Symmetry: C3
Subunit: 104 residues, 3 copies
């Protein structure tokens, strides 16, 4: 059971909830955590840009990571939203079993 | 087949454990316990996280606390077992992510902190 | 990937992208640190989560602080210079400075992130 976490940055909690709902309804993720009140900073053409966003963490498997990314991207209002995968190298076996059973 | 020794996911220098607690009191207690036992070096809490999932055919949204605990690969199983046993849920989220590099002095403190 | 290759020979490596975790004592400090590493092009972007609670067990007593969880997006080539920059400007003696590897991601986002460090 090869789990991963997918980080995605949403503009607000409404949007993060809509995104999470979509991917969970398509069984591309087992569950989603939303972390509100994120301040993002970027540096474009000589100027620092600050925004207030929501950090999402979506729990899935390597087999589903691409389709998850593609679905999130499609439904996301941004053209090129942050979508990154981190590996899970360990975890509780029963949890990892539920995570994997949950998926399409 | 392929060796990426400076991004070597197979041999972590440290680990970060994600655990979700139902409320802030429980998360502080879970943190206190694993810290006092020297199974993690630091715990970071983010209360008011929202968890979204299907359970029993229905889409839930729950207020929960995101826990981030710092430890080493040698301690990861002991940490997870301790968290799980003390956690009110039977099967809480307990996931471990690899650290492929860390500030030397920090890693020295982390090792010095753990049993 | 976009390589016209047998699926066995596709995606044989991982992105140079990494995420760096650091904790700061307060929002203004976290913002100034982030802005510095960005100005120096040691990260592509920074995400801050203010109003976190950290707990430590130092010298036999549990301690609890309000802190900012920082997550910096960078690459393996820059991870050491980023850490060294954060460390030099951090108020703490031995701040948390940990690199997590990104193993996959949206291609266009990873292209922008790679280009950002140039
Ligand atoms: Mg990577
Ligand atoms: Na989009």
């Amino acid at each position: 059971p090869e789990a991963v976490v997918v980080l995605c940055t949403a503009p607000d909690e409404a949007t993060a909830q809509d995104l999470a709902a979509k991917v969970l309804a398509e069984k591309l993720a087992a569950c989603a955590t939303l972390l509100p009140g994120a301040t993002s900073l970027y540096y474009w053409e000589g100027k620092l840009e600050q925004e207030y966003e929501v950090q999402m963490i979506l729990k899935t498997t390597v087999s589903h990571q691409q389709a998850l990314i593609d679905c999130l991207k499609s439904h996301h209002p941004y053209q090129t939203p942050e979508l990154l995968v981190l590996p899970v190298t360990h975890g509780d076996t029963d949890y990892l079993s539920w995570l994997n059973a949950s998926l399409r």
